[PDB]
Amino acid sequence: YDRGVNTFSPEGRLFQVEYAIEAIKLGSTAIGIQTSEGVCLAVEKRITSPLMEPSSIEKIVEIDAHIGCAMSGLIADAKTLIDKARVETQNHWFTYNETMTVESVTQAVSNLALQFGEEDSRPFGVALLFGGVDEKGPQLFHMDPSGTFVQCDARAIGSASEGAQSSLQEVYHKSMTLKEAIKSSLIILKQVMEEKLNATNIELATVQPGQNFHMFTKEELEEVIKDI
Amino acid sequence: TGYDLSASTFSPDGRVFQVEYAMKAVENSSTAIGIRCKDGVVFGVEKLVLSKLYEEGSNKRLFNVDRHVGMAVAGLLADARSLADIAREEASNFRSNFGYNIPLKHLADRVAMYVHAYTLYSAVRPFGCSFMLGSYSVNDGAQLYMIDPSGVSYGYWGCAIGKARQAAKTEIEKLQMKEMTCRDIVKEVAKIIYIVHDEVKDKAFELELSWVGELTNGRHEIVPKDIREEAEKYAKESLK
Amino acid sequence: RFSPYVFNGGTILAIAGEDFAIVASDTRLSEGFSIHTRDSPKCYKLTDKTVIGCSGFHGDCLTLTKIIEARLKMYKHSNNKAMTTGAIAAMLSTILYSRRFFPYYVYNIIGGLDEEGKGAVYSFDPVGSYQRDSFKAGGSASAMLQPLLDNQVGFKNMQNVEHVPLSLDRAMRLVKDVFISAAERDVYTGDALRICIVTKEGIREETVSLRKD
Amino acid sequence: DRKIEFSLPDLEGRTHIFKIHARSMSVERDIRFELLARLCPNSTGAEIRSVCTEAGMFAIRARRKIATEKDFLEAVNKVIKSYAKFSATPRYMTYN
Amino acid sequence: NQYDNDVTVWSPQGRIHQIEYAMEAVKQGSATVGLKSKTHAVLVALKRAQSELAAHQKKILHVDNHIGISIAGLTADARLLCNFMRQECLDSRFVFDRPLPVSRLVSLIGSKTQIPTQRYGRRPYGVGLLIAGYDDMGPHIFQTCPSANYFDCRAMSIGARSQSARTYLERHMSEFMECNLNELVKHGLRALRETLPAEQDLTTKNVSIGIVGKDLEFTIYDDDDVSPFLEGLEERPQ
Amino acid sequence: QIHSRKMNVSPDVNYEELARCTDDFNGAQCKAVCVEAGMIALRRGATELTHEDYMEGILEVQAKKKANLQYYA
Amino acid sequence: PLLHPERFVNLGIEPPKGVLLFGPPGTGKTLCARAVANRTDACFIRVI
Amino acid sequence: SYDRAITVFSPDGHLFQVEYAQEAVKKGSTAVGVRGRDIVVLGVEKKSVAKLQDERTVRKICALDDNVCMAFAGLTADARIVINRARVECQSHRLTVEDPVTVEYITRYIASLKQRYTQSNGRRPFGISALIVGFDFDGTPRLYQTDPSGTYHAWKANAIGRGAKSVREFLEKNYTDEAIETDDLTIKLVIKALLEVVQSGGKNIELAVMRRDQSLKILNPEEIEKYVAEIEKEKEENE
Ligand SMILES: Nc1ncnc2c1ncn2[C@@H]1O[C@H](COP(=O)(O)OP(=O)(O)OP(=O)(O)O)[C@@H](O)[C@H]1O
Ligand SMILES: [Mg+2]
Predict the structure, then answer these.
(1) Cα separation, B44 vs B162, whole angstroms
(2) Is D1–G18 a contact, with Cβ atoms under 8 angstroms apart?
(3) Which residues get modified to N6-acetyllysine (chain D)?
(4) Long-range CB contacts (< 8 A, 24+ apart) of H223-232?
(5) Is A71 within 8 Å of A127 (Cβ atoms)?
(6) D and C touch per CB criterion (3+ pairs under 8 A)
(7) What DSSP element (H or E) covers E82?
(8) What is the number of alpha carbons within 13 Å of residue C32 lying toward its C-beta?
(9) Can you tell me the distance from the alpha carbon of A29 to that of A43, in angstroms, rounded to the nearest whole number?
(10) Of E148, E157, H109, H239, which cross-links E113 as Cys (Cβ 3.0–4.6 Å)?
């Protein structure tokens, strides 16, 4: 009874979606931190080849001009979720002349991830981190293949997910600043990855209230790493 | 056994066990009896209280299909609710296409053919319900019908559906039901319920009595037994 | 043969204040040369900061009001907040265009407060184009009210007169004077005057009688 | 009467197991073990000890008397990745 | 074990096991308690944390101005029934211009959940809805189940270890009809504290209380306004 | 009820409520629930039993355990 | 029970007398049997 | 154990039927491709004519539009559907939007068409991998690649087919950060890369270049024989 999305267990819960949670584990790590000054975000690349072009590997995509994103797990299912998440923020501005809030973005995203066998296919294999600054300030959210949606203050997913969480709960507090949280995030990264941390293994993305631009760092990132 | 998975397959001796399995699921439900006098039909349902938090009149098994037609279901209660809405919808189209009340002989045929259709395909299962149909008219008198999960539907003078299907009809047939009035029937239905295992190995119960006939002028409603409480006063005197 | 449209009359007035908004309308419902009732206001409290007025064909006014009130609830449980004044005007423009080839015969004016606490008046057409204005007058007596408010509110064609902003008390007597002069020359206007005042403390109402002929 | 079953240690179990089977061997005094417990997802206590024995065997392939970090990283590929996966490692580009 | 695969397949004992397994998904969720007086119906739920610093998952959600529901079970079947619930509430406002009677809205749910418990191709809805409402004849407390049965009741507790909450409700149900909201709410949340392990306490960050009244619209209080309700309480007798 | 004669049972336990959740057991597994429930209360040093103490003793017979399964809110 | 045979009687319970160990191979079955032979202070019988 | 379905997961989170489609790519002839300063180049190996057939119907290199090329692997049947479909999209894009089609747009169409073709049961996925090379998007040379899972991706030098691991390891020690100007030098890099063929017969190489302004220029087995001669001229310095 463990090969069907249309079949329960004697105890409870799928396994099917439980197996879809396991597909996240073989991804890459990603850390996002919510701070009152804004939301920073970090990820690991895992570049395989030197001939492999680096900017064709995306981990941070721009959903909207005040909302970033992060992903892990299956790359093939991720590009489907990013597509409508750009469209649903665009349909909302067309009919309301306003920016869709960061919480209500994922409401539209979770409404299709819970449609895998509930029409009249398989569940997805990708967890997502959504950071953005809406009218309620900076926000940071999290979802899963099971459509379970929640708000987090600082979250780390992918591979090395549980090992990051124990060290990440140690140093977080409410009165952080943005420039402190950036250098606090990649102390965790060089302790959980196996290669030496340089300017080519990671990439950053921030968002601020008055600086809704710049969900990326372009070589400034070399200044942060050299002062670790 | 083995060839008993689908409802569209035959046994090597020639019967469908999926219909046979759903019949004895009705057997585990509590006893609901039905009886008709010369000028009416009187229903009666033994219904047990779940624990204590039941709120005295919830999830009843005495439905109301038409102005003069009601049900006395027993078995899976949720499956009977969907089946009752079919009979509500079937009697409405007969009104809109012919302009008068549905005859009970024609109503039971339309329902039993609908129950029959769920015993043929492998996509759906047979129902797990059995029920009663009672009505009264001035051009037709009183009738009382009976539908199994297989779809066999024909008329009785008295019946029982539940655990004590045999144990109730033993003492139904010792009544002179051909000439009694359905006010004297109501005090006689209540003792048939209380003889056979009301709260002996069970915890508690509550009696429901539905009611249709000449005194209601064709209407179907619950008894005013709340008034004067005479069913329990007359049946609890049969302790010895 | 059957014709699907008829004219019912009505007159709607809105004035955007500095920190307030005033919506006024008459309560006369007529058709042809008959009076259906003398008590039928055109004001509709959508939210605690937004009042809409609907003139024209009355059957479309009852329909379009209930569509907007349904979508207010559909916005809220999807977003955990209420709509703004400008969000309703953006939503209404898509609803009016959605029946482009069978149009609503309704003139619409939305008045209320923005997110800064100032007045805002949006005017409409039966197909769905809109703009933000300071004062508009829609309905059957629309031509009899726009030139006078250009003199008093907009200070047009005046010389040697300072531009003092309109206070609340001065704006009340300007509304009470234009409907007396409009009910004299127009036949689709009279029998009452419902006035709704939208401020930061809620919505007030006030009724002034007119001539009953 | 009692059905005690044994399962695989999640992460905190394995990080304790590496500190048992590698405390009595000449290693570099600055390495971390939590990175090693990542790379053994579905592994037993016997497989963890086989990694600890194999990493010292690479030190005798070279001429050393202490174990480095890359000694253990090659030992994980020797024990697990040489038998657990061969299609998912080169043709990996579905997951990053 | 071969009969334990589909919803269509009956058993030689006459019991479909797939409906019997969807009851087990209700016991995975946390406990929640609903009750009512003559005038006021209050349902109280219990939040559960995911991590040490994520937000707690919400349980009570607004539906209409006179209807609010609780939840226990799958979150996939939760919002799928909510979107069916909100659509039916505004259709009676758009057509009949009246609010729905609460007793006949739940009959639409039992017709909704009956089809995926008979036809192949869709599992039953693993869900534990508690319903409070106001028709013209006072408050109501309803529960549902994945076997598509709906039970009218005056007090009910479902979820994890909710049997200990039922024992508190049975020996205090005589007191519920007369008392008002200052103690009727804290009659209810004295029942949640037996569904807890005996070392931690019901704090302000893990509980939600929703009140709908005869003259009161359905209002959800959480994490800031629970403090006027948690005042004036005794501790557990330890 | 027979094998629980020799212990400190708090009198809010209905054995009919236990027969709701216990199914397809023989007589010896019913004895095994009664033995294991006495030791679960011994873990935290409890002095009497409860209905919750039996429910964990039921899952121990077929050797089950429960987590936060993150589907169930 | 071999070191405190009191709290079982002084509460009114009996200890179990048979324990099976099951699971994947190489998980630690023999270790738990090998370690209780160290700290037993009693008769212990391996059976081939 | 459990695969036999494209919708089921493994207990450790895998799609084996998707992973088995990549195993069918390794039965194909190798094809390499690099980008340069102005001239992009791609070559294929393993012609192996069989003495009795016409060789103009066994072509592995086709053009989708006027300034984009195509090289593939896998099995020949599934490539013909993807090629014929991509010619329609790179022509219908020009009708709806009057620009020429960029090299990035056509690779997202091939990947997304292979994406939804993996999700539904009873649809066997494409067992091909493709190389899209085009210096079309405003004078900029680019080359991408595909995958049977449906992941379009960009490299700077690529190898596929039966023996891609040796060639991709060869080019990492050979592709200089010094950009290969004097584009016959860049063509000689491919012939040196294709010199590590499965048999290296010399006359089994079909190199096709593009000077980013003209059309496709299929090389003849007399100009390519001249480039094979100068590769042996540089090999004389070993003694
Ligand atoms: N939890 C653990 N902690 C430390 N070491 C362990 C653990 N589990 C296994 N080992 C190591 O693995 C080795 C083999 O384990 P062992 O043979 O006892 O497993 P087993 O389950 O008894 O095998 P089998 O099931 O085949 O009898 C032991 O020598 C021990 O050093
Ligand atoms: Mg052993």
Answers:
(1) 12
(2) yes
(3) 85
(4) H224/H191, H227/H184, H227/H187, H227/H188, H227/H191, H228/H191, H228/H202, H230/H188, H231/H188, H231/H191, H231/H192, H231/H195
(5) yes
(6) no
(7) helix E75-95
(8) 4
(9) 6
(10) E148
Domain count for chain B: 1
| CA D52/CA F7 separation, integer angstroms | 51
CB contact at 8 A, B148 and B25? no
In this structure, what token pair is assigned to residue G21? 């160990």
Let me know the angle formed at the C-alpha of H237 by H236 and H239, rounded to the nearest 5 degrees.
85
Structure tokens at B110: 């339309």
Residue A142 bridge partners (DSSP): A129, A150
Phi, psi of B199, deg, nearest 5: -140, 35
Tokens of C73: 């609830």
Which of G30, G32, G34, G36 has most ligand 1 atoms within 8 Å of CB, for mutation?
G30
The C-alpha of C59 sits at a distance from chain E's nearest C-alpha, in angstroms, of: 15
From the CA of F36, how many Å to the nearest CA of chain D?
Answer: 9
Give the CB-side neighbour count of residue H113, counting CA atoms within 13 A: 19
Q: What residues contact residue D15 under an 8 Å CB cut-off, 6+ apart?
A: D33, D34, D37
How far, in Å, is the centroid of ligand 1 from the Cα of D13? 14
Q: How far apart are CA H93 and CA H99, in angstroms?
A: 8
Identify residue B45 by its one-letter amino acid code. V
Q: Cα-atom radius of gyration of chain B, to the nearest Å?
A: 18
Instruction: Please give the single-letter amino acid code of residue B60.
Output: K
Q: Extract the runs of DSSP E, i.e. beta strands, from chain H.
A: 31-34, 40-44, 61-65, 68-72, 130-134, 142-145, 153-154, 157-159, 206-210, 217-218
Residue H46 CA to chain centroid, in angstroms?
A: 14
The two three-digit tokens of residue C106, written as one number: 């309704």
Backbone angles phi, psi at H133, to 5 degrees: -120, 120
Q: Tell me the C-alpha to C-alpha distance, in Å, between residue E205 and each of A204, B176, C159, E49, E58.
A: 33, 70, 66, 10, 11
Rg (C-alpha) for chain F, rounded Å, is 13
- CA–CA separation, B61 and B52 (whole Å): 19
The answer to whether the CB atoms of D38 and A163 lie below 8 A apart is yes
Q: Give the single-character DSSP code of D89.
A: T
Q: What are phi and psi of A103, to 5 degrees?
A: -70, -45
CA H186 to chain centre: 17
Residues in chain C: 213
* Secondary structure (3-state) at F11: coil
What are the pocket residues of ligand 1 if the criterion is a CB atom closer than 6 Å to any ligand atom? Answer: D 17, 20, 45-46, 49; G 25-31
Question: If we measure between CA atoms, which residue out of A12, A27, A14 comes closest to residue A122?
Answer: A14
Q: What is the dihedral of CA H115, H118, H119, H123, to 10 degrees?
A: 140
Shortest CA gap G47–chain D (Å): 20
What are the structure tokens assigned to B210, written together?
Answer: 């539905």
CATH number of the structural domain spanning residue B8: 3.60.20.10
Flag whether A touches F (3+ CB pairs, 8 A cutoff): yes
d(CA A104, CA A193): 34
Residue D80 in tokens = 């697990």
The pick from D4, D20, D33, D44 for probing ligand 1's pocket by mutation, whose C-beta has the most ligand atoms within 8 angstroms, reads D44
Token pair belonging to B97: 């296409």
Q: How many residues does chain D have?
A: 96
**Pair type for strands G19-22 and D2-5:** parallel
Asked if residue B111 lies in contact with residue B86, where contact means CB atoms within 8 angstroms, the answer is yes
Map residue C85 onto helix, strand or coil.
helix
Identity at A72, one-letter amino acid code? S
**Is the distance from CB of E34 to CB of E168 less than 8 angstroms?**
no
Are B118 and B81 contacting, i.e. CB atoms less than 8 angstroms apart? no
Query: Six-digit token pair at E54?
Result: 């994520």
Our separate counts of H helices and E strands in chain B read: 6, 11
| Contact predicate D11/A163, CB 8 Å | yes
